[PDB]
Amino acid sequence: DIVDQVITIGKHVKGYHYIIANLGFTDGDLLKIQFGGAEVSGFQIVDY
Amino acid sequence: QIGGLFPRGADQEYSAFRVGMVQFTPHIDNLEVANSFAVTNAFCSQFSRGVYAIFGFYDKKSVNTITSFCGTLHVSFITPSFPTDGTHPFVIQMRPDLKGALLSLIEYYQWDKFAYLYDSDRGLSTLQAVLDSAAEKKWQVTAINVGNINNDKKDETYRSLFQDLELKKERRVILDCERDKVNDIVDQVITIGKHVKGYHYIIANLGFTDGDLLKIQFGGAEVSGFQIVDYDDSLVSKFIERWSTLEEKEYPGAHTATIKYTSALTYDAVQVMTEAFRNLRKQRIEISRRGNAGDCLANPAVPWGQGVEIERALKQVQVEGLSGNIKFDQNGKRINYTINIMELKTNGPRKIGYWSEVDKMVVTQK
Amino acid sequence: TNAFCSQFSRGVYAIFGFYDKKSVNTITSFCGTLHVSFITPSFPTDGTHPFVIQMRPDLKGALLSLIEYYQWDKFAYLYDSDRGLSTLQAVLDSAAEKKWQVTAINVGNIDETYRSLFQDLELKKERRVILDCERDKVN
Numbered sequence: 250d251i252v253d254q255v256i257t258i259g260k261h262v263k264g265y266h267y268i269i270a271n272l273g274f275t276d277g278d279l280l281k282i283q284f285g286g287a288e289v290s291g292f293q294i295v296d297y
Numbered sequence: 298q299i300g301g302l303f304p305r306g307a308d309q310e311y312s313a314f315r316v317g318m319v320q321f322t323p324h325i326d327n328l329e330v331a332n333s334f335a336v337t338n339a340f341c342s343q344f345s346r347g348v349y350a351i352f353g354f355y356d357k358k359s360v361n362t363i364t365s366f367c368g369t370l371h372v373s374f375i376t377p378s379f380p381t382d383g384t385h386p387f388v389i390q391m392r393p394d395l396k397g398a399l400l401s402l403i404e405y406y407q408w409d410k411f412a413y414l415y416d417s418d419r420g421l422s423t424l425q426a427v428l429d430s431a432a433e434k435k436w437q438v439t440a441i442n443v444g445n446i447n448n449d450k451k452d453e454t455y456r457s458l459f460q461d462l463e464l465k466k467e468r469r470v471i472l473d474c475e476r477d478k479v480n481d482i483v484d485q486v487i488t489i490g491k492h493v494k495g496y497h498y499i500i501a502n503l504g505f506t507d508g509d510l511l512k513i514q515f516g517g518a519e520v521s522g523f524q525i526v527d528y529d530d531s532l533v534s535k536f537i538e539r540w541s542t543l544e545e546k547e548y549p550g551a552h553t554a555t556i557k558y559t560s561a562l563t564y565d566a567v568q569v570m571t572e573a574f575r576n577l578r579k580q581r582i583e584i585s586r587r588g589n590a591g592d593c594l595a596n597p598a599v600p601w602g603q604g605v606e607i608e609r610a611l612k613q614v615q616v617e618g619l620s621g622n623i624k625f626d627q628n629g630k631r632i633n634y635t636i637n638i639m640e641l642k643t644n645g646p647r648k649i650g651y652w653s654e655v656d657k658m659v660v661t662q663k
Numbered sequence: 664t665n666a667f668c669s670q671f672s673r674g675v676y677a678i679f680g681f682y683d684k685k686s687v688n689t690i691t692s693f694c695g696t697l698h699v700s701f702i703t704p705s706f707p708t709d710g711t712h713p714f715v716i717q718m719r720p721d722l723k724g725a726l727l728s729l730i731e732y733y734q735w736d737k738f739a740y741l742y743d744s745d746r747g748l749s750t751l752q753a754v755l756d757s758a759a760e761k762k763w764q765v766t767a768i769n770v771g772n773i774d775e776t777y778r779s780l781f782q783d784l785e786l787k788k789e790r791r792v793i794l795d796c797e798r799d800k801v802n
């Protein structure tokens with residue numbers, strides 16, 4: 250939800266940095282912020 | 298007897314067709330619109346079936362087929378799709394002409410430079426108009442067509458396109474495309490993050506409130522467009538009451554409070570056909586063919602004469618629809634119509650003005 | 664369409680013929696559907712279309728390369744609609760690519776009008792002009 254709102258305000262561009270503080274980081278959809286340029290890092294407990 | 302041809306996927310247009318069928322004998326076909334073959338086949342089937350008129354959609358790949366066959370067999374064609382280039386007979390374009398409204402709007406914002414993204418599948422007529430008015434004004438313009446490129450590579454090619462518009466830093470962009478294509482492009486813009494302040498967009502289609510604006514509304518970038526159906530009308534509001542009454546299980550997309558401009562054009566089109574035949578009955582000319590139509594590919598082709606009198610009827614009939622004043626000229630174009638000019642603020646889309654053929658543009662953090 | 668179907672009923676293994684920008688989609692569609700082969704000297708279809716053999720090569724790259732050879736920075740493009748706007752798209756995109764000032768006019772949709780037209784192209788007094796049209800229109 251928050252991610253959607255960030256993309257809406259347009260704060261997903263370069264120079265912005267986000268840290269997702271939950272496990273199963275890839276569970277949520279990253280495809281929509283992936284092209285924005287803002288760097289996003291998180292944690293994954295299950296290696297595919 | 299009449300034909301109706303629907304492109305796969307136009308649900309709401311068929312919903313408006315059905316509503317217009319109840320409110321006022323159709324033979325329905327569902328086909329790939331862009332496939333010339335399916336079109337020819339359907340058309341000939343309708344001709345053999347003995348239809349007095351044909352209402353349907355066409356694409357930029359299929360336009361010439363329809364125009365040619367209708368100009369040859371003198372069968373009349375009613376369409377919500379974009380207007381043919383030049384003068385073509387027996388084609389009634391429900392859709393008005395936007396070119397002058399776009400140019401007048403560009404003249405309203407008084408831009409010196411802009412980016413034009415055109416859809417090939419929509420036609421390059423609009424493209425022909427805008428270059429000429431640019432070379433006249435001292436205007437600086439960059440224009441490219443997005444559709445030739447494959448959909449899978451669309452994300453990469455789009456990001457390439459908008460990273461190209463950052464070589465000239467073009468902030469102001471025009472989008473001449475169907476509302477669908479518009480929405481895709483919009484999603485990509487929101488993805489790159491080019492929906493922020495200082496960016497300006499002009500949506501070059503009649504469908505401005507039809508497409509979802511809620512997602513770019515909060516971005517800060519200003520977006521303006523065109524709307525052909527004012528919801529501030531008594532006719533439109535009565536229709537909207539009806540449209541909010543309807544079940545979504547019967548007519549797809551029909552429960553919503555808003556309706557896409559294409560559907561409105563369909564509803565208004567069956568209204569026009571009905572009033573045209575009624576007006577032919579008031580004149581008491583004979584409507585009915587003498588025998589089975591025969592084969593559309595008959596050599597040499599036999600045009601039924603009464604067909605011409607149909608074409609005239611459809612052309613001479615004038616009515617009040619969701620679009621405004623519905624009146625046609627000799628080539629089938631809309632005349633002296635109302636195009637509401639819309640800007641998009643933070644509190645939702647607003648009507649800044651309107652456009653008539655003879656009036657031109659008329660406008661009404663701590 | 665009539666001719667094509669007549670040929671099909673007659674049972675032809677291949678069809679050699681010309682087409683126009685108004686007739687191209689008919690041919691491409693019917694040949695892609697009925698898997699009959701088509702051989703044409705006319706301009707090449709845009710994109711990938713099956714069962715169409717375009718005898719004519721692609722000139723777009725040669726034109727752009729020539730414009731790069733004369734190293735023009737500004738020019739006038741007179742295009743014929745009846746030929747197709749593919750080259751127009753090519754030169755426009757390549758205009759936006761390398762900083763070109765290009766004015767494109769539709770000359771195909773027309774004695775007095777010509778004399779008006781060429782005295783219109785004298786506002787910037789531009790000397791260099793390109794003509795993308797059939798040889799008749801060219802003459």
Ligand SMILES: *[C@@H]1O[C@H](CO)[C@@H](O)[C@H](O)[C@H]1NC(C)=O
Binds near residue numbers: 622624633655
């Ligand atoms: C527009 O057309 C209608 C007829 O359809 C006419 O009553 C009206 O006068 C026209 N508008 C103007 C400003 O003349």
